[PDB]
Structure formats: C-alpha cells, structure tokens
Design a protein around this ligand. Structure first.
Ligand SMILES: [Mg+2]
Ligand SMILES: [Zn+2]
Ligand SMILES: [Zn+2]
Lengths: 84, 138, 145, 65, 144, 225, 85, 49, 202, 50, 70, 212
C-alpha cells in the first residue's frame, strides 16, 4: 500500500505544479510529454502546428526545465539524494 | 448463545442449597447465590414474612443480610431453565463479570463461559458406624 | 555498569553473505563497477571491479558486491520519463540487483572469497586473492625449510 | 449437539466439507448470516458486543419500514 | 574455607544501600556464581512491519522483502476478542488489515488524510472460496 | 554552624589514599558521605586511548606476524593504561619496537606534557621475525562512552586504516566512607568522615574533593535562583 | 451489501451465463515468446488481459478508454483484477 | 562471490542469562555503579538475583 | 520481542522500543508531517523517517500519547490474554511490561515473546480503551476474586512491614498521627515493627 | 475485592499502583536472603529415622 | 482534569452504547464540523469524547442535533 | 566540564502547607543524589521550635488519667506535639495556661510573652466538663523521649512528610535522563517553597569553604 500511494500522490502533484508554474510554458511541456492525457509527439510534429519552427519549441523547454528544477529543490524533494 | 433479551417474564428456577456433606459445610450459601437474581419471593423461617418482595438481584450487601436470618433454601433463575428463543435473557444470567454491575444487552456469555472451563484444564491430573461432629437436633 | 564497561559478555559473530551470477536469455550477469542511479558515496568504499575492500566498515544498507542484471522492454511511464530529462539521468536499460546487507546488521568484512568457472573471465579482484594465496604458500614453505 | 448447526459455513469448519456441501446442495436451504461464527468467515460485523446496534438497524430496515 | 579467607561463618553479610545510603537490617547472601550467556539475543527476535509484499492467490503478507515478517492471528486470539464487546476490532484485523485489494489501498489514504473512514471492503479469503465452489458444479449466490 | 577547613590527606599508597575532612555536625556526616561517594563515580575527568591506528593491519580481527598475543588482546591492554594530560586536551602518541623484546607502557616516546603513571604494564610479546608500529591517540572525557555513540571525525575513507576503541576511562574505582568520633571541646554531637578513596593514579586525591565540591554547588544553586 | 448466502444446483443454462468463452486448446503459453494463446487455459480473450490497460498484440494501451475491444485481438482492456472474476 | 562480516554483539537489556543450575533470566536494566549494593569494604555487586 | 519487567510503569501503560514504534506507526507519521507543514509530499516524508533526523522524534510522540495498543502472548486460554495498554517510548529492544499484570498473562520472564497490535480505526481505539484496557479487567471472569493481586515479590515486602515483635527499638512510645510515624522511622530512631499506639482520622 | 466493591474503580487502580510501589521499596530495605543456615534441620529427625 | 472512563460507564451501565455515542461524537471533532464543550488539554479526538460523557454535557440527543445544523 | 543545570518550570502548590516541585533537566545519577541529600536535611536535622517539657497537676503515670476531663490523659500529650510554637527572643522560656471555664479549652487562651508567637490558635487541646506547666526550647534534630516526673516526644522539624519519586524525562538530546519530584508538608510556620531554599543553603555552606 505504500508503493501504490507514492505513484498516485506524485501524479497529482506533477499535474498540479504544471498548472501553477506558468501559462505559456505549461502548454509546451504538456505537448512534448502527454502528462494530462495527451499523446506523445516528436519535435517536428509538435512544431508544425505550434511555433512554426523546430528550435523555438526547444528553447522554451530548457527554460521551463530549469524553473522546475529549482521548485523541487526548495520544496523538499531532494533529488540529489534520491538519484545520488 | 449471545444475550439478546433483557428479561423473559417467567419464574422457573432450581433450588440452591449449600454443601452439607460430611461433618462441616464446604461452600456456604453466600457464595452460591452471589450475584444471582431471585426467582420467587423468599419467605422468613417464621410463620409468614417476606424478605424480597420482588425477587431482584443479590449484591454484596444482601449476602450478609441472609446471614442474620436462618434462611437456607432459596430459588434463583438460572440460564438452564430460561424461556427465550435463540439466546439467553439478561435477567436470567448472573452478574459475575469483570465489572460489578449486571450484564449488558449484547455480551457474548457463551464464549466467556467455555473459556473459563477449559483454561484450568492444564492444572488437572469401612464406614460401619457413623458419628456426628456438631451437636444439634435430628 | 561494571559488566558492560569491562567488555565481558561481548561476543563476536561471523555472518556470511553469498552472491550468485545467474545466466538468462536476456543477457548474462557479470560483476561490474558502475551501478545505475548511485552516487560517489556509494562507490567510495567499492573498488574498480565491484567488490568491497577487506576491512571496510559497512553500515545497514551499503553496496557490498556490484551485481547488475540486463533487461529489455521496460515500457517506462510518461511520468517517469519527464523526470529523467530534468535531472539529466540517463535511461539505464539494466536493472540494479546488487547484494546489500539487511537492516540492523553492521560490521567489518574480514575476507572475501571468490569462485570462478572453467572458461569464464576473471576480474582484477580475483588476481589479488590468488597472489596472496601463492605468496603465503611460498613464504611459509621457504621458512619451514 | 454441535452437528445441529443450521448454517453450512459454520458446520464446514470441524465437520467434513464434502458432507455438508452435498446436503446443502440437494436441499437448497437459503442460510442467513445470523450468529457469531458465520460472520468471521464471511467478514461482516459480529452482533455480539458493540455490533448489536448494527444488525438491529439492518433487520429493522428490511421489508418492515 | 570461610574461616581461612577471613570471611563470615554463615556466609551472609549485611550490605549498604547504594541509592539511599542506609544499611539493610538483614544479612544478605553474597558470593561468586558462574553465569552463562545464551544465544537468544534480542537482535534476532525483535522485528516489526506495517506494509510489505503479498502472495499471488491469497493476499496475505509474507517475507522476501528483507524487512520483517508478519505474525499469525490464529483462532485462539479470535475467541478472545469475541469474549469482549469488540466488533470493529476483530472485523478490522480480518478484512482491512489482511486479505484485501481495494480496502488496504483506500485505508492507507485515510491515515495520511487524518480521518479514519473505515471502508467495508471484502475479504479475499472468501472471494477465492466462491470461485472454487462454482467450479465444482455446485451453485452459490447472494440473495441480499 | 560548622564548616570543614584545612582537610587532611593521608596518603598510604600510590593507589589507595584516605582523607579525613573535618569533624562535622551530627546528621550531616552520613549525609555528605553518601553524597560525595556518588559524585566521585559518576563524572570525573579522565583520559584514555580513544583510537589506535596500525599501519600493518586492516581490521582488529586479523592477527599480525611476529607478535605472540592477538591484536584483539593488544587493544584490550591499552584500556588499562593511565595517561595524565596536564595542558593539552588531545595528543597523538607513537610506538615502535623491533626485536625479541616485550613492549611495555614505558616504550612510548616521552613528551613534555604527557606523563604515564604505570611502567610495568605489558602490552604484547614480540619475536625476532616480526615487529610492530602504531600511533596512539588519547582524549579528555567525562564518563563512559561506547564506540558507536561518539561518531565524529570521519570522512568515509579511514575505515580500513583507522581502528576505534571503547572509551571506558574511570579514574576512581572504590569509595568507602565511615563515621568516626572526634573531640573539639565545643559540643557533644561531633563526627568526621573518613573517605577511603581508590584512585588509579590519573588524578591527585586532594584535587578529587575540590572537583567534587564545585559540581555539587552548581547543582544546588538552581534552588536559590 | 449482501446477505442470505444460498446454495443450489449449477444448471447447464446458468453455467453458460457465468463463462465468457469456450476453452478448446490445451496449450497455454508459446515456447519462444512468453505470451498466452487464444482458446487456451490462460487465454486473454476468455479470462482477461495480463497487464494493466493493455491488450495482447499491443494495439490499444492508452489509459483513456476504460472498456473497449481491440479489432486485432478480441480482448477487452481492463485492470489486472478482472482475471480473478 | 561470498563475503564474511564480523559483528560484535555486546550485552544489552533483553538478552537471556542463566547459570549451571537451571535459572533462566532476562536482564532488565543496566544500573550504574553508585546504585549497586556495597559492603563495608566498598565492593559493589554485579548480578542481583 | 522479548518481554521485560518494569517497576516504574503505571497499570494502564506499558513500554515500547523506539525502533518498533517507528515501524508500527509509520502511516501515522506521514499524516502528521503533511498537516504540520514540514513535509510537502508523501515521497519526501519517507526519506525523513529513514534518515533518523532530530525533528522526527518530536512528531512521533504526538501520536503515542493517546493510542491504546494491544498485547497478547502465544497461548491464549482466556479473555485476559489480550489486553490493551498505552505505549511509552522507551530506549532498548524489549517490551517493558507491568509486574502486576503478569498474573493474568501467566507468563514468566525467561525468554517469552509477546506480539503487539496497533488499531487503526478510531472506532477500534474507543472499544480498546473502554473494554480492553488493563484498568477495566481488574476482576477475573471465572469468579469474584480479582486477577490483579500482588505477586510473590510484592507480598514479601508487605508481610515484613506488617509483623509483630516482642522487643524492638522505639517500643512503647506514642505518635500524633501517621505523619509522625513516617518521620520517626526514616530518622533511624524507630524500628519497622514496634508495639506503639497512634490516633488516626479514619 | 472489598476496596473495589465499596469505593469504586478510579480509586482502586490508584490504590493498586501505590500498593505495588510500597511493596518494592520496602522489599529492598529488608535484604531477605536464603542460605545454608535457614534450612533448619530438626535435631529429632535422626531419632525417627533410626 | 484527568481522564474519567469508569464514571461514565456507570451512567449507561451498558459499555456498548457509550462506544457508539463516542464514535459519532469523535468524527465531528476530527473533521472539524463541531466544537467541543470541554476545553482542549493537548489531547486527541478519541479521549476528549469520553470526557463529555462523564460530565453529562452531551447525550444521544445533542449528537443527533449537531448533524442537521451547519 | 559541562552539565545540565535544572530550572524550575513550575511549582505545583496544592495547599498552603503542602507543595510539590519538579526538576526536569538533570543528569543520569543526579536524579536520586539531590533528592536523598535534601530529604535527610529537612527531615532529620532542621532548625525549629517545639515543646520539650510538659507538666500538669497530678502527673502520676502515663496511664493514670485525671478527673474532671472527658478526654484521656494520653490524648492530651498527643495534642501538644502538633502545636506550632515559634519564638525568637529567648533560647528557652516557660509558658503557662490557667483555664477555669468549662466547655472547651483552645490553644489561643495560652498566655504568650513578647517573644512567644503561636501560629495555629484554633487547634483544640482538651475538652473540659485544670492547670499545667509546659516548657519550650529550640531544638535541631527530631529527638524522642528516650534520649536524655515529665517526659514527652519533641518534633522541632517544621516539615512533616518528605518524599521524592525519581522518574525518567524525555529529552530531545539525551534518551535516558531522569527528573526529581519533591513534595513537602509543614505545619504552617514556614513556607513550603522557602523551606527548600533554606535546606539547600545549609548544604551549600558546608562545602563552600573547600571550593574555588
Ligand atoms: Mg516462559
Ligand atoms: Zn430466561
Ligand atoms: Zn489486440
């Protein structure tokens, strides 16, 4: 029962952290990774309908990745100790 | 055999008498009628007098009260002569429990009575002329 | 307090722990040095072959023998894939099934005995065991002569 | 006196299983969960003790109003 | 031998108290006695667990996780709980704490939330008995 | 009404020493005697070998070549040493001897602030085919402390090199007090204390009473404030 | 809830209502791959899927559709607890 | 590859101690030296049966 | 775990090791850390109870104050074999049991083991405190004789206290009340059993 | 059994704990011990055996 | 100012309705629905429900009335 | 040389004569050393004042009673031991009492001088349906009648019942520490809280001469 609760509590927090992180950057991470029920797509398939470029969708990905990296550090997730 | 009724309403019980075997008594009346309800109205050994007008339960105070009078034969309501269906009345059952009050409505008295017998089981394994010891009448 | 300070009833227990190398159709198991999803503190007491040094003080939950098991068709979830790109963790397709000491058992390794089969390659840790056994069987026979 | 149990789940504990289930099959007796040994195998509340108030409300609201 | 070693004849000498400091008003038998140490230490018998792995057919806790081992709740402890007025205690140790699938997962969330809802659930020891009876050509159903 | 002044220290031996403080009032003699006995055994300044590092062995279980006694028996002999630290709190000592000669407590290199009481205490037996060399490290503590409680001064790299010991230093071993009678020609209820102190030699019996007086006064001061 | 547990005879017309498929082949798992086969003692069409929300051939594996039947393999996607019922 | 650990299990409250005459016993606590009963000489006892 | 007698415990409470209370009350710690605000998610709270920090012991004792745990021996031949106690955080690896309650369990201290049980539902905590408590089952269910009786060690100190002697120290004196008997005895001027006369307010 | 019947349960549990506290404190003051001199063999035992 | 679990059992003389009455009362304090009459002494929700039974401030009628109100 | 110094968090005062203190932070072996050292000073040898001599008209024997008094002669000597008399002017004085009226004889009718002060004036002595000569002095320890006609026991100690229970205390730093719980009971001549500060001062004065 402990392992089944960690996967459920983390899934309810990942989708919640994306809706409170930003507005324009939230739809880019959801399009690259289908965490809200969407289907996974490549960089050329996602960029053909949004951004109209192959490098504009990757520049926002690294910026939003560094922002979520600082959230998990100050929240108390301690990723440096889990992955070691 | 869980208790489901508070009282049946009948008067059917066996007589209780102390152990008068041998020369002296073994168990007096104060221990065999300790915590049991009285079936019928006990009468004084005199001409015509009543002690218990309703026949309620006997507490520790009524035990010493019977030692004042010379009463020796009393009747009590036992669970072997009850009147309920699929159970045992609370009034017909005694009051010997972990508490000091009467039994409750819903207490499983059938399990606590079987464990009390099987628990001490591990601890278990000429006359030509007779005479008297205490002087008295015949 | 005089019976504990004087070290009277303090006995010594010797508990052994053996590790095996199973052979499966998905891939052979070998004793390696690199372990997925670990750090420098976990590999500090370990050598370059995957065997704990002789005399290293180990705690409850340390890695003694490095044993990895290859696997295929992991079918990872999209929630776990999102975390593999943030912290920069590579997707290791080999599961970590190394030997670890149980909880509440801590001590000091006195010796390590290895066993190899015919036609199998050996590591640098087994070379130091046969060298100490060959030097001992040669220094003592030269001294008794 | 222990072989006169109307239930089959409480009679299959000490007696033979194939002897109680065979008689209960050819008879078709719909047995209820009244008692103490029946609710232990099933997993419901026990009427003895604090569970008497639960079975009283269940029987009251059953084709009675 | 007590006379040669400058010791009392009866072997009982009065000792002084360590905490209060007074003298005991009775002779105490002292001396040296050989004692042993058995291999029944508490490091091999003390263990506890809350969650762990379960079997395949019967959802019962067992070892294998190198954490601890669950104890058996035999029938002797069942008759003891029925002797009291315990109804929800015995029902908890038979349905929620063991032999369940949805009841154990839903109960663990109630402990973290702070309110004990005590969901009913269904014991897994009886669901297996239904599938084994229906496969023997004998019918069983719930009339409700 | 009476206070102990100018106590007497009757030193009959290096280890056993008796002291007679002063003829006190009746009632306070037996009270102060049992009170001072529990202080000399609870907390007293002492020094002992905390850890020992040998550059020829990995762990304490395996024996070495040339020494008759086992390594475990060597570490059990270091606990019986009596090292006195005057100024320094923590000092590092060395020991090295080669040849067919037994090693004792006097084989340690002398220091200006390190004074060892016993010199006849043996450590291990040597031979001609082997030799020993190790480094000792002592410290100043208050009471008994095991090796698993004082987990400090570690970097996850000195596991195979450094070996820790069980710090069980206790300068006081046996304390005995009796109630005698004395005459002062002032009152009739007079009694003195005769403390039979048994010190291993790490501390002087005169300073033992002074160090046991400031600790009791610090505990009784909480009632005033 | 439930009450009044009864016992009767298993009618031939009632057994067909409990079952979901007919078992005709005795083989269970293929030799090379570790996957069940149709009309077997461990088949996925009759009893249910092996994994959670995944068919046999792997065509439908999303977590959106709770109940659906794949066109390639006639198996209804569900959880792992349906195989016991 | 097998290893060998060396654990020194010191005595603690909970262990079983007995003699040669058949008197089992579980140790309760570890009392200090000042609390043990001592004679007129000053030798505190260790085991209190 | 192995049982151990403790003379410094009350009749309604017992002892419990610190390492056992962390494994039994593990789901109760995760609920207190999230409500307080120290742990955000449930995954971060798992690494706090396994790291043995200094703040996990203060939050642990909050759920042990009022939580009757169950105790039972291996052979259960009566209802008094399963009694509920209040656990107290003690240091060690043994269960500190009450000396008077040992008469009901019929267990001696020679290496016996008693299992523990932790009720989760608050409905089970109320029926364990009002029914399974050690203060409620003070009378044996067999007869009217109480099951909580002073054992051999307690009755030995009470028999020597109440004894008659012909000649003793301080015999023949009088006292004002019970406060004068305790002062004259502990002062070393009166014997433990001496023929005296006192006046009490009963 | 008489204290619980005429007083109650709240004052009986506290009385049972204070009776145990005064039973262990006074048992340590009286250092009762069994020895070889406590087994008093009667001098007339040899007369009956002979 | 102490726990009284024996005086409250003599009022009902059942020891079974007291558990059912304290269960429905403890859930109203753990969920934050109602406020207890007795002040808080750093106690939990299970033991505080038994303090109101011995004082007579709550009964089977107050618990039923606390559920309809909001 | 660091130690845990105790601090009184609260002083449980249940009555004017009965108090109860607690010291949470203590050492390992100090929870019982400070309790026994303070108990022997307050109980055995505490400076106070009580009655040392009691003589009445017709002191034949201990069992020989006196006529005209409804109470026995044994109960008269038992009521004088509980009387609280405190004087500071002279070291040893002699009091007197002459009561001619019947009904009741109280302690407030005793003629006191400028130095003799009585704490409890409502304490009854004997019931009359008599003339005595008592003498008070200053004593240090509880001395019985056997030590050193007229003779009776004396109780110069202001406190009556002194005890202490040592129990463990949960500390966030140390896992095994015990606390001290002291309780006193006096006859009202001295504050139960101030009596502890006086006993600790006597024990401190006997050691400050050999400290620095
Ligand atoms: Mg046993
Ligand atoms: Zn009936
Ligand atoms: Zn398919």
């Amino acid at each position: 029962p402990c392992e089944l609760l960690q996967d459920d509590d983390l899934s309810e927090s990942i989708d919640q952290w994306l809706t409170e992180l930003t507005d324009k950057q939230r739809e880019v991470v959801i399009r690259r990774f289908g965490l809200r029920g969407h289907e996974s797509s490549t960089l050329e398939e996602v960029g053909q309908e949004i951004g109209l470029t192959r490098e504009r969708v990757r520049q926002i990905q690294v910026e939003a990745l560094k922002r979520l990296r600082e959230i998990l550090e100050k929240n108390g997730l301690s990723s440096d100790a889990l992955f070691q | 055999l869980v208790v489901t009724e508070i009282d049946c309403g009948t008067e059917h019980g066996l007589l209780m008498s102390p152990h008068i075997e041998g020369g002296d008594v073994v168990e007096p009346l104060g221990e065999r009628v300790l915590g049991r309800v009285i079936a019928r109205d006990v009468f004084k050994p005199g001409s015509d007098e009543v002690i218990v007008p309703a026949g309620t339960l006997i507490d520790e105070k009524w035990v010493d009260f019977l030692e004042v009078m010379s009463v020796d034969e009393v009747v009590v309501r036992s669970p072997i002569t009850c009147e309920t269906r699929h159970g045992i009345c609370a009034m017909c059952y005694g009051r010997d429990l972990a508490r000091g009050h009467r039994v409750n409505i819903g207490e499983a008295v059938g399990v606590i009575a079987a464990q009390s017998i099987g628990e001490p089981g591990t601890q278990l394994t000429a006359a030509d002329n007779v005479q008297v010891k205490n002087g008295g009448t015949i | 307090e005089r019976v504990v300070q004087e070290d009277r009833f303090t006995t010594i227990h010797i508990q052994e722990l053996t590790c095996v190398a199973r052979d499966t159709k998905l891939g052979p198991e070998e004793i390696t040095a690199d372990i997925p999803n670990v750090g420098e503190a976990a590999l500090n007491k370990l050598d370059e072959a995957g065997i704990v040094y002789v005399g290293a003080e180990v705690q409850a939950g340390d890695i003694l023998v490095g044993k990895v098991t290859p696997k295929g068709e992991t079918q990872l979830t999209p929630e776990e894939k999102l975390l593999r790109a943030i912290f920069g963790e590579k997707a290791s397709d080999v599961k970590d099934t190394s030997l670890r000491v149980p909880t509440g058992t801590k001590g000091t390794v006195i010796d390590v005995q290895v066993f190899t089969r015919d036609g199998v390659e050996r590591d640098s840790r087994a070379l130091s065991i046969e060298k100490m056994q060959l030097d001992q069987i040669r220094k003592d026979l030269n001294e008794e002569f | 006196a222990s072989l006169s149990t109307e239930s089959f789940i409480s009679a299959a504990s000490f007696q033979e299983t194939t002897r109680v289930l065979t008689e209960a099959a050819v008879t078709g007796k719909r047995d209820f969960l009244r008692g103490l040994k029946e609710n232990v195998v099933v997993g419901r509340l026990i009427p003895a003790g604090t569970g008497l108030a639960y079975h009283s409300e269940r029987k009251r609201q059953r084709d009675l109003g | 031998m007590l006379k040669l070693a400058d010791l009392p004849e009866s072997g009982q000498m009065r000792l002084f108290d360590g905490r209060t400091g007074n003298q005991f008003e009775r002779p105490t038998t002292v001396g040296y006695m050989y004692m042993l140490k058995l291999n029944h230490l508490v490091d091999d018998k003390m263990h506890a667990r809350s969650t762990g792995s379960y079997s395949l057919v019967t959802q019962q806790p067992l070892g294998g996780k190198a954490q601890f081992g669950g104890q058996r709740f035999g029938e002797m402890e069942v008759w003891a709980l029925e002797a009291y007025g315990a109804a929800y205690t015995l029902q908890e140790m038979l349905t929620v704490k063991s032999d369940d699938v949805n009841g154990r997962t839903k109960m663990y969330k109630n402990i973290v939330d702070g309110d004990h809802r005590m969901e009913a659930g269904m014991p897994e020891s009886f669901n297996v008995l239904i599938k084994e009876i229906r496969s023997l050509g004998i019918d069983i159903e719930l009339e409700t | 009404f009476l206070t102990p002044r100018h106590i007497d220290v009757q030193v009959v031996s290096q280890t056993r020493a008796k002291i007679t403080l002063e003829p006190l009032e009746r009632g306070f003699g037996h009270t102060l005697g049992n009170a001072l006995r529990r202080i000399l055994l609870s907390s007293m300044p002492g020094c002992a070998v905390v850890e020992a590092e040998i550059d020829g062995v990995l762990h304490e279980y395996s024996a070495i070549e040339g020494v008759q006694e086992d390594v475990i028996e060597i570490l059990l002999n270091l606990k019986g040493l009596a090292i006195k630290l005057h100024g320094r709190d923590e000092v590092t000592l060395t020991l090295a001897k080669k040849g067919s000669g037994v090693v004792t407590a006097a084989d340690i290199q002398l220091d200006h602030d390190v004074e060892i009481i016993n010199g006849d205490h043996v450590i291990a037996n040597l031979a001609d085919n082997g030799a020993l060399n190790m480094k000792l490290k002592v410290a100043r503590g208050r009471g008994y402390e095991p090796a698993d409680a004082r987990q400090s001064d570690e970097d996850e790299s000195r596991s195979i090199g450094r070996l820790q010991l069980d710090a069980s230093f206790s300068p006081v071993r046996r304390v005995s007090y009796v109630v005698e009678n004395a005459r002062v020609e002032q009152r009739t209820n007079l009694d003195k204390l005769v403390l039979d102190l048994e010190t291993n030699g790490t501390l002087d019996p005169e300073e033992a009473i002074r160090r046991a007086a400031t600790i009791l006064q610090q505990q009784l001061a909480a009632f005033v404030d | 809830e439930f009450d009044a547990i009864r016992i009767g005879l298993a009618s031939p017309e009632m057994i067909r209502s409990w079952s979901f498929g007919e078992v005709k082949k005795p083989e269970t798992i293929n030799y090379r791959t570790f996957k069940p086969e149709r009309d077997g003692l461990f088949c996925a069409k009759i009893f249910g899927p092996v994994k959670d929300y995944e068919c046999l051939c792997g065509k439908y594996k999303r977590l959106k559709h709770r109940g659906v039947i794949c066109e390639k393999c006639g198996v209804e996607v569900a959880l792992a607890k349906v195989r016991r019922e | 590859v097998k290893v060998y650990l060396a654990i020194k299990r010191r005595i603690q409250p909970g262990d079983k101690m007995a003699g040669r005459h058949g008197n089992k016993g579980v140790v309760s606590v570890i009392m200090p030296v000042e609390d043990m009963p001592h004679d007129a000489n000053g030798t505190p006892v260790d085991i209190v049966l | 775990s192995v049982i151990t007698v403790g003379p410094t415990l009350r009749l309604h409470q017992c002892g419990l090791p610190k390492k056992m209370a962390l494994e039994l009350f593990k789901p109760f710690i995760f609920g207190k850390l999230e409500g307080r605000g120290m742990a955000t998610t449930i995954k971060a709270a798992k690494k706090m109870v396994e790291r043995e920090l200094p703040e996990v012991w203060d939050v642990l004792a909050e759920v042990i104050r009022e939580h009757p745990v169950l105790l039972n021996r291996a052979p259960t031949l009566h209802r008094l074999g399963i009694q509920a106690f209040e656990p107290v955080l003690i240091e060690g690896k043994a269960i500190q049991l009450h000396p008077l309650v040992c008469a009901a369990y019929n267990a001696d201290f020679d290496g016996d083991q008693m299992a523990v049980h932790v009720p989760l539902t608050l409905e089970a905590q109320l029926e364990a405190r009002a029914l399974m408590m050690s203060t409620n089952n003070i009378l044996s269910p067999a007869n009217g004789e109480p099951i909580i009786v002073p054992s051999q060690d307690v009755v030995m100190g009470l028999y020597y206290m109440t004894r008659e002697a012909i000649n003793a120290k301080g015999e023949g004196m009088a006292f004002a009340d019970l406060q004068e008997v305790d002062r004259a005895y502990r002062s070393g001027q009166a014997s433990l059993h001496a023929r005296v006369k006192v006046r009490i307010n009963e | 059994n008489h204290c619980y019947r005429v007083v109650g349960l709240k004052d009986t549990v506290i009385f049972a704990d204070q009776l145990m506290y005064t039973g262990f404190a006074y048992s340590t003051i009286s250092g009762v011990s069994i020895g070889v001199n406590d087994f008093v063999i009667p001098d007339e035992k040899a007369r009956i055996i002979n | 100012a102490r726990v009284t679990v024996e005086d409250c059992l003599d009022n009902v003389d059942n020891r079974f309705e007291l558990v059912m009455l304290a269960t429905k009362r403890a859930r109203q304090l753990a969920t934050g629905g109602k406020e207890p009459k007795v002040a808080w002494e750093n106690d939990k929700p299970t033991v505080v429900a038994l303090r109101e039974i011995a004082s007579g401030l709550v009964d089977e009628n107050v618990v039923q009335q606390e559920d309809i109100v909001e």
